[PDB]
Nucleic acid binder design. Structure first.
Ligand SMILES: [Mg+2]
Ligand SMILES: [Mg+2]
Ligand SMILES: [Mg+2]
Ligand SMILES: [Mg+2]
Ligand SMILES: [Mg+2]
Ligand SMILES: [Mg+2]
Ligand SMILES: [Mg+2]
Ligand SMILES: [Mg+2]
Ligand SMILES: [Mg+2]
Ligand SMILES: [Mg+2]
Ligand SMILES: [Mg+2]
Ligand SMILES: [Mg+2]
Ligand SMILES: [Mg+2]
Ligand SMILES: [Mg+2]
Ligand SMILES: [Mg+2]
Ligand SMILES: [Mg+2]
Ligand SMILES: [Mg+2]
Ligand SMILES: [Mg+2]
Ligand SMILES: [Mg+2]
Ligand SMILES: [Mg+2]
Ligand SMILES: [Mg+2]
Ligand SMILES: [Mg+2]
Ligand SMILES: [Mg+2]
Ligand SMILES: [Mg+2]
Ligand SMILES: [Mg+2]
Ligand SMILES: [Mg+2]
Ligand SMILES: [Mg+2]
Ligand SMILES: [Mg+2]
Ligand SMILES: [Mg+2]
Ligand SMILES: [Mg+2]
Ligand SMILES: [Mg+2]
Ligand SMILES: [Mg+2]
Ligand SMILES: [Mg+2]
Ligand SMILES: [Mg+2]
Ligand SMILES: [Mg+2]
Ligand SMILES: [Mg+2]
Ligand SMILES: [Mg+2]
Ligand SMILES: [Mg+2]
Ligand SMILES: [Mg+2]
Ligand SMILES: [Mg+2]
Ligand SMILES: [Mg+2]
Ligand SMILES: [Mg+2]
Ligand SMILES: [Zn+2]
Lengths: 102, 25, 102, 144, 129
RNA sequence: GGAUAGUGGCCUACCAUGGUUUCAACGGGUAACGGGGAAUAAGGGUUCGAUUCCGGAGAGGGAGCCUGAGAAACGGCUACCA
RNA sequence: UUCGGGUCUUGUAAUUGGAAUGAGUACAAUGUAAAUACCUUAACGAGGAACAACUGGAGGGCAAGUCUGGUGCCAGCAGCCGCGGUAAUUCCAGCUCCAGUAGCGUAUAUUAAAGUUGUUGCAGUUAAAAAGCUCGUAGUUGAACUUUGGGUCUGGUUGUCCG
RNA sequence: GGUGAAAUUCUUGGAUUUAUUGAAGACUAACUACUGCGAAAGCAUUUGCCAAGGACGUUUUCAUUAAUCAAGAACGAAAGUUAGGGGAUCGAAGAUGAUCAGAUACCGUCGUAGUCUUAACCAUAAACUAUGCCGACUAGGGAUCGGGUGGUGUUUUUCUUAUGACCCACUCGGCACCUUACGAGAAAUCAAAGUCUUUGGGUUCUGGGGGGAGUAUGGUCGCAAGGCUGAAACUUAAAGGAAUUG
RNA sequence: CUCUAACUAUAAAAAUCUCUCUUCUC
């Protein structure tokens, strides 16, 4: 079904109100919940341009933007596919308390 | 759903709740 | 939508009819929606009459025939080709298939 | 034919029978039962003053994706809690939570308009002044 | 059971007229049908018609000329004021240039225009045009 | 018979067992004072009527009463309750 | 013969004049119990006549843009259908244009639309809906027939011939 | 045996068949149909008894006694519940041997309650013709069931009449059918779903978008299962009907 | 313008499916 579709990138760093987070489990209705690297478990919504275009699963470091009025929830934006996640761990912008390897 | 089995499910629920009523007294 | 004006039952003014078991799968069906065939056959097949004819006492024996109706559930009647899935304007023709040989 | 009575002296049933079937129209049932007075936090009011608690973002339905900037509020007139919508672009950050806000209807007779689930009401006036006045830069929030 | 014989009479008339017949057999044949048909006939929707004795309720057979278009009966004979006559004329008759609402009056069976000129009004029976 | 200005279970004494009701009594609700009316409009209707007019009721809630032709008054009293 | 007189008119111009006048002031007078205000009226009071008209809207419903720039399934709009994921006629602005106009915009009610409460005037096979069937009180409705024709006179009201 | 193939299971104590018998309860095959009866459920061996009913015939009898019908009532498939009786077949539960990834499902064998009864509850079914009942009219065609009509009719046969059974032309009533639209419907279709905007024969009972939900609650009947009655808060722009082309 | 005769015989297993829905005016 690729004929119906629209048919080596680089990482993007967090910028003043967004954070890298690790998904802990995938929730229904299209939602998800992720630990932000602050000691907090936030509730992320899979944003548009993202829903059924690029997938994500458990144990995947992924960028999420916060909403300034209600910190308890947030919306996920940009995914990182398992190789620039190591780079993210390397550059040290986020604490390395969470290593994810298989 | 078949309406038949939904009716059966609610019916069994009623039976359990009325047994709860009876045991409570 | 009412598929058949005769309701596909042929009861029409009887309330309820005794049920009869199918001959193949033994499904009970009303004795009117109970597609039914007169299985009249010679006790011996015509392919083997001659062997009987010239090797038997009682010259010019009757060679009787075996008689029985067959009652099918309509599922069997359709799968076992007893009844075909006819077309619309051809449904309202009830005459048997033109007396197979005449 | 037309299986309702037609004799001169049948008037009674023609009234009472109608007096039964009127209970089918939801408008009539609401009007006689006064369900607008027990439920529907607006006790028949077209507007009510409440206190805002927190500013929320609410998702949208399937064909439309966007974060609608809604807002919780507890109504003074009864104490109930409802959710309302901020009906312009740059106006959520006009609310200044723990603020007196005047709520109105929302364009569908006590229902949910469009793609904002679980809401029933607009927002018209914030801190006395009307919100559209702020969004047009005609008047300014008192900030008191 | 049969309730208003006039309704059955006019229903037979309309049915047999629509099919294009020329004669109609009215079965019960009570006073009101006879008066109705004399009013009809003097207006001209009907030709030379006939009553029959039967020692019981009689019978009618009525000739047509195809002049008629539709007849009908307002079975619950409503009380009409002298004012409400215009209401029925508007609601039943096609156009006031013709048509006749037939009602029973203190004078007797009578079409609406006769009722208005005699300045009397009673209960309505039917409508013909 | 009392009491009323006067009929009246209006009340008292002695009697009788009656009274109403599926033609909706009794009960419950009314964010209902009733009405003249207002909005609405092919005709038929639907909704509203706190309020410019007419009646009724009330002067915080209930009760009691003097004066006076007229009040159970309330910008008049007595008592209880808030 | 291409013309071109614009010969006759209409419009369009930051070109250009002189007329006319109120909103506002205000002599007064009237108006009123006293007064305000109106109705008159001296003198003042228009040039960008800044003495400035807003309110909604231009995808359809529904009159009006496939113009410009911005955002880029975000913000937001949208009563409903839907617009927005890099060329947005739907957001946000600018320019044009539409509708009503000192009015217009909302929200909750209610009315017509609604023949979607149907008495006039609804549907009941499958779209919601005909009690499983029958009896039956109340209710509702309930066969036909008992003085119709004739004759006269006469009051008028209409259109006759018209005096 | 049994199946698509197989296994479980019974079998030299001889299973399977081969004959006679006998027991039990079951049902009444084939006759069996676009045929009959009944209000509906439903009803199928024979015979007798008991009562009943439709339709037809009637120059018989009474004279509005009629129709539908809230309230009230009687029946009411199967399953179910009591209790007592029976206990074949077949089979919910359970036990099994297969298939499969799993299959405690469909196929396969055993097997409890039921299935059949006797008195009493249950009163629901797609209890469907998904068409309420009583009336009148409207178009052509046939047969079919019940009755009654007339044949210079046929065979019947008892010489001949009588019956019966048939043939014809009927007629009244019943289940229905075919053709058609000149009527309707949105259509599928309907001889009524026609006689409805040219809108009125008499009458009951139901519905007002879909969900929430026949759910919540209160009654009410029932031992119980549950039945009748019966919402709302709230949530949505559809759900749905018929047909067309893929 | 005379008529009413033939007939056969199959079934094992097969679960699920991520977008993207877009005008008709001469
Ligand atoms: Mg491509
Ligand atoms: Mg999201
Ligand atoms: Mg019958
Ligand atoms: Mg058949
Ligand atoms: Mg009132
Ligand atoms: Mg009032
Ligand atoms: Mg007053
Ligand atoms: Mg007073
Ligand atoms: Mg006060
Ligand atoms: Mg005095
Ligand atoms: Mg007082
Ligand atoms: Mg006073
Ligand atoms: Mg005092
Ligand atoms: Mg100006
Ligand atoms: Mg706008
Ligand atoms: Mg504008
Ligand atoms: Mg337009
Ligand atoms: Mg653009
Ligand atoms: Mg714009
Ligand atoms: Mg109207
Ligand atoms: Mg409707
Ligand atoms: Mg359905
Ligand atoms: Mg349906
Ligand atoms: Mg039904
Ligand atoms: Mg029925
Ligand atoms: Mg009665
Ligand atoms: Mg009569
Ligand atoms: Mg043996
Ligand atoms: Mg038999
Ligand atoms: Mg028979
Ligand atoms: Mg009843
Ligand atoms: Mg049983
Ligand atoms: Mg197994
Ligand atoms: Mg099992
Ligand atoms: Mg089994
Ligand atoms: Mg077995
Ligand atoms: Mg039912
Ligand atoms: Mg509904
Ligand atoms: Mg439901
Ligand atoms: Mg209950
Ligand atoms: Mg369909
Ligand atoms: Mg899976
Ligand atoms: Zn079968």
């Amino acid at each position: 079904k690729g004929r119906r579709g629209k048919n080596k990138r680089e990482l993007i760093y967090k910028e003043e109100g967004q954070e890298y987070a690790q998904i802990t489990k995938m929730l229904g209705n299209g939602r998800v919940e992720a630990s932000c690297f602050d000691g907090n478990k936030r509730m992320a919504h899979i944003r548009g341009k993202l829903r059924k275009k690029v997938w994500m699963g458990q144990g995947d470091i992924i960028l999420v933007s916060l909403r300034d009025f209600q910190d308890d929830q947030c919306d996920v934006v940009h995914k990182y596919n398992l190789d620039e996640a190591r780079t993210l761990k390397n550059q040290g912008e986020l604490p390395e308390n969470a290593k994810i390897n298989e | 759903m078949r309406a038949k089995w939904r009716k059966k499910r609610t019916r069994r629920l009623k039976r359990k709740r009325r047994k709860v009523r009876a045991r409570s007294k | 939508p009412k598929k058949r004006a005769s309701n596909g039952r042929n009861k029409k003014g009887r309330g309820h009819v005794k049920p009869v078991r199918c001959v193949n799968c033994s499904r009970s069906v009303p004795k009117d929606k109970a597609i039914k065939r007169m299985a009249i056959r010679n006790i011996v097949e015509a392919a083997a009459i001659r062997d009987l004819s010239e090797a038997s006492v009682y010259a010019e024996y009757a060679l009787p025939k075996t008689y029985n109706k067959l009652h099918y559930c309509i599922s069997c009647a359709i799968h076992a080709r007893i009844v075909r899935v006819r077309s619309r304007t051809d449904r309202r023709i009830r005459a048997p298939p033109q007396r197979p040989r005449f | 034919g037309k299986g309702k009575p037609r004799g001169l002296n049948s008037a009674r049933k023609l009234r009472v029978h109608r007096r039964n079937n009127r209970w089918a129209e939801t408008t009539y049932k609401k009007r006689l039962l006064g369900t607008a007075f027990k439920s529907s936090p607006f006790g028949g009011s077209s507007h009510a003053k409440g206190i805002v608690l927190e500013k929320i973002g609410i998702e949208s339905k399937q064909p439309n994706s966007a974060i609608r900037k809604c807002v919780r509020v507890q109504l003074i007139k009864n104490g109930k809690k409802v959710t309302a919508f901020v009906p312009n672009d740059g106006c959520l950050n006009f609310v200044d939570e723990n603020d007196e806000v005047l709520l109105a209807g929302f364009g569908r007779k006590g229902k949910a308009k469009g793609d904002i689930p679980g809401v029933r009401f607009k927002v018209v006036k914030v801190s006395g002044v009307s919100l559209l006045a702020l969004w047009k830069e005609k008047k300014e929030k008192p900030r008191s | 059971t049969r309730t208003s014989v006039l309704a059955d009479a006019l229903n037979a008339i309309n049915n047999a007229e629509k099919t294009g017949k020329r004669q109609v057999l009215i079965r019960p044949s009570s006073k009101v049908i006879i008066k109705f048909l004399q009013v009809m006939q003097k207006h001209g929707y009907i030709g030379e018609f006939e009553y029959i004795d039967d020692h019981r309720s009689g019978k009618i057979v009525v000739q047509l000329n195809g002049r008629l278009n539709k007849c009908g009966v307002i079975s619950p004979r409503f009380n009409v004021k002298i004012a409400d006559v215009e209401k029925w004329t508007a609601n039943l008759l096609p156009a006031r240039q013709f048509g006749y609402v037939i009602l029973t009056t203190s004078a007797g069976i009578m079409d609406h225009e006769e009722a208005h000129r005699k300045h009397v009004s009673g209960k309505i029976l039917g409508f013909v045009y």
